[model samples]
Target: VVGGTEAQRNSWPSQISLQYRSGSSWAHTCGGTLIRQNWVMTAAHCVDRELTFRVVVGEHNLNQNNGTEQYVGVQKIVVHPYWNTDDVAAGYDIALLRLAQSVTLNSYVQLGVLPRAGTILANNSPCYITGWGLTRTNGQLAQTLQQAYLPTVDYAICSSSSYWGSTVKNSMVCAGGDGVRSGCQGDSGGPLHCLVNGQYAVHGVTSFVSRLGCNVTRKPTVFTRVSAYISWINNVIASN
Candidate 1:
């Protein structure tokens, strides 16, 4: 989950919030990115049997009033065919949710560009991650949009056995601080933005690992590299 004070709202990326009812109360499933007017990229794990969910857009505060809120049902849920809940190494942790209605694009809420080949996002390469996740581990999930700036980790360091090591695949990039600013719980399905050509590109999606505390220095956060999935994504988007 993304963590920040109210002052950080302006820097938070605009996307849809997945909300639903559990029993007598409500809950936030996970974060998602707006790829098209009626399509969103998310994590397959978020799918539940209830199928009672809504997408809230154009707002920073999750509990209060602000930007436009478009409530839509999911028409289809596509989980990557190779995704495995037990195998963290496969890392096929991606999904797409098709909305019943389309969303209006604005400056704050728009599709992000893709990064080109050979574009290296390295240490201190100023990047941002936004989500409606928890503010702190074991804390209640935040109802406000929050963001944090994280530096990309060196590949050698990130691929070390002590760190992510061999588990970091070619289709993944690593980033985070020494536990100061890191991706925590509820950040799943959120986009990792790297600035390229003066525009923020959706380079990665929040994935899994053994821990979320991110305490080890050089221990990096794993993200599903968007470049590696572009063709598949394009094909899916085209067909849908």
Candidate 2:
């Protein structure tokens, strides 16, 4: 039940959303990866900013009726020790959430693999990114899941003066092209994946600034490299 045909496989919605209740309504805190039956990986800012929230996973259309949805409470939230709200680069933006209940694994809701180190995911590698974030930088968040295809970017080009000017660090991997498809606000912590070894493997976690737009040319979308965090992630999951 954890794997299926490509036609039935919905990529981005596989990750869960953490929604918190405010004074009278609920707001999406952040995106999360459903890495295990009872755990998820997310950005620390989400947990620190909105501690109490529920994890909603496996829903394709958040606006209308679609795939099955699973809701679970947060039992524990683990944020990176070095996360800093003021410093985006040093934020280390990682966090993990232990679900109060485990989700049932299916073709549409399953764990993804991590790519190997030094794996050359070239430009236009046919990768996908999904989220319930805004369609545009200034746009309102969408009620349904949305997806975009992003191309891999060269680190040197991303860090050059033409871009953020050395702000892009080695810990982040770049994707997308100038004035082309890309990840934007509210997409943070969502997975950047490519098909590897007959399966979708998480290569990055959405991060970075897109100056021009979601389709900014030459300006790449950045992500936290999954390969680099493999050991840390494994240790965390194993210890629990």
Candidate 3:
């Protein structure tokens, strides 16, 4: 969130903080969406490191006690088999984490409402990208959660030669090439909360950004299109 404001507490209830043990202290590494009490959807690259990981629900501030936070360990990680770390542009950057135990839901914590299967947002659909990621490129993470209005950039404009060019795919959602408000380091795996049909639904899992900078013109933030994997998500949950 390069040019965004602090998010109201519990404003986006499905927003969660994914942290990794950093010796003596746990550190916020990425953002995730709580689609189920026992499962969280994040980017595959976020969990690629072989480190002890935990999901923090109802977390607004990473520095102080939010009092609504629930810490849970990851029991299992399910990365899409087609996901190649070497080829993020090829898509399939999504991953799911099974919590060791189911988390209780409340006002501060709730399951993310996902878009209907195969649903697509029209060009420039209103949406917000939320996370505890960086407020600036190469800067430290925000103490509190942040959000930015990142309108959807349809595949047509986003994939153009002047924009991301040949890198983006249909499996990804492109948003906010405004060069001011965009996802940055640590924002990976977060939700792209699109305001669809009056209610907001999780339409994306923050995937990648420009290699040049966090907020770059004509380079909208890329996300793993959640609608494209609805079946896969349900199958994994049912069989697990």
Candidate 4:
């Protein structure tokens, strides 16, 4: 988060910290949304390094103990088949990880609601992006979770030459190009909760931002639109 504030505890219950083994301890690398008791939705690139991955639920603080935290190993990873490591701009950056075991649900741990299939939020809709990513483009990750108000930037405006241009696809969601608030490094694979129908639903999976900077004018944060893959997700979960 380039311009964000500390998020309230359990505010985003489905928000998760995806970590990988670093030396002898685990380090948070990306954020995720718990879509099921044993499934997590994140970005494919987050697990591209082939490192041991773990999911931390109810994680508000990374440096201190948070009684609600629950750690679980990734039993399986299912990255979208068409996802190309070199062509993230073409969409298909989404991935799902099956937990070794189902985690208990509580106020701190819950499933993230997904929007209806093929749903796309209207332009300028209110939403929030939450993560433990950097507070600045090259700064350190926040000790506590952070969130930023990101207004939805419809595809028409986002894909214009002045904005993301050809780099963005219809399968993605663009939000908060204001340059004052946006997602940064370590925020990848997080959830973009958008309020629709009077309820907030997980709409986007944090994907990419401008290469020049995390928060750049006219370059909103791009996300893998979750609604575009509801069937694929259910198929993956059912067959596997």
Candidate 5:
């Protein structure tokens, strides 16, 4: 995340590090939200590549042992059927990962509460984008989890020619076009937690940033609207 600070270990317990096997080590590729003991919410694009994957819960620092981390292999992956790697702008970038084992709940690891179906935050609603993504565009990932305040931009304005234009869709959410703070590489699939009714809910799955830059003016970080897929999420969980 560009222009972010180290996040408190337990502040966003639902946050997770999605990693893939790389040589002798595991590499963090994207962020995800633990929606259940064995279920995670991430972006379909994150798993488009054919690779072995794992989930690290209760993780804070990628380079240090926090003694709170729980590593689990992915049992299955379910990407949205309509999601096409060549057409991210068409909007079906969500996915789910089923953990091999149910993780134990603790202060450092918990489930993320999701927004109600059809829920949409008002323009400029308070939200935070948390991840281990780069602190700058084309930079390395953060050692520790980072978070930045990214206020939501309403669709009507985000879809304007100067902003995202035709790429911004109602099924997605746009946030933080200040050209200062935003989600960057390695942040994809992370949570966009919005404050609603005095509580924070996972309302978005980080999808894309502007091609021009991570913090480009008038091009906020785009996310897969989580509320729009609540029904799909439930059905997948129930049937699988």
Candidate 6:
């Protein structure tokens, strides 16, 4: 996240690091939300590449041994069939990963609470984008989790020509077009936590940002609206 602050350890317990095997060591690729003990919600594009992957729960720092992290192999991955890699703007960018085993619930690890189906945040709703993504455009990933306040930008405004324009859809949520704080590269598939009714809910799965830059004005970060996929997520979990 560009212009973000280091997140307090375990402050966002459901946050997880999705990593890929990189020869000698695993590398952090994307962020995910632990929606279930063994299932994680991430962007489909994150897993488009065919590679060995593992998930690290309770991870705070990528380089340090937090002693709270749990490493698990990915047993299965289910990317939404409607997701077209060539056209992320068309939406349906969400995916689910089934872990080899269930993770234990603790202070450092917990399930992410998703918003109720069809729920939509009001314009400028308070929220935060959390991940290990880049702190600047074309920059290195943060060693520890970082979070930036990224208020919601409602559909009507975000779809305006000055913003995401034709690419923004109702199935997607827009936030932070301030050209200062925003989600950057490596932040994809992370959670956009919105405060609703006094509780924070996982309302978005970080999708795309402007090609021009991570923090471009009037070009807020786009996310797959999690509420729109509640049923799809349930179906995938129940049938699998």
* Most accurate candidate by lDDT: 5
Candidate 2 C-alpha lDDT tens digits along 86-145: 776763777788889998887668876667765756555666776776766566676766
For residue 70, give model 6's deviation from the true position in Å: 0.3
> Distance (Å) between predicted and true CA of 169, model 6?
0.5
TM-score of 1: 0.88
Q: Residue by residue across 94-176, what tens digits does model 4's lDDT show?
A: 99999999999999999999999989888999999999999988889999999999999999999999998999999999999
lDDT of 6 by residue, 137-221 (tens): 9999999899999999999999999888899999999999998999999999999999889889999999999899999999999
**In model 2, how large is the Cα lDDT of residue 71?**
75
Q: Give the Cα lDDT of each candidate.
A: 0.70, 0.70, 0.94, 0.95, 0.96, 0.96
Pairs that clash in candidate 2: 178-216, 178-217, 178-218, 179-215, 179-216, 179-217, 180-215
With a 3 Å backbone cut-off (N, CA, C), the pairs that clash in candidate 6 are none
**lDDT assessment of candidate 3:** 0.94
Q: C-alpha displacement of 102 in model 4, angstroms?
A: 0.4
After superposing all C-alphas onto the true structure, candidate 5 shows an RMSD in angstroms of 0.5
> TM-score per candidate, in order?
0.88, 0.86, 0.99, 0.99, 0.99, 0.99
Backbone clash total for model 5 is: 0
lDDT of 3 by residue, 153-172 (tens): 99989999999888989899
Worst 10 residues of 6 by lDDT: 192-201
Worst 10 residues of 1 by lDDT: 1-10
lDDT of 5: 0.96
Model 1's number of clashes is 4
Residue pairs with backbone atoms closer than 3 Å in model 4 (clashes): none
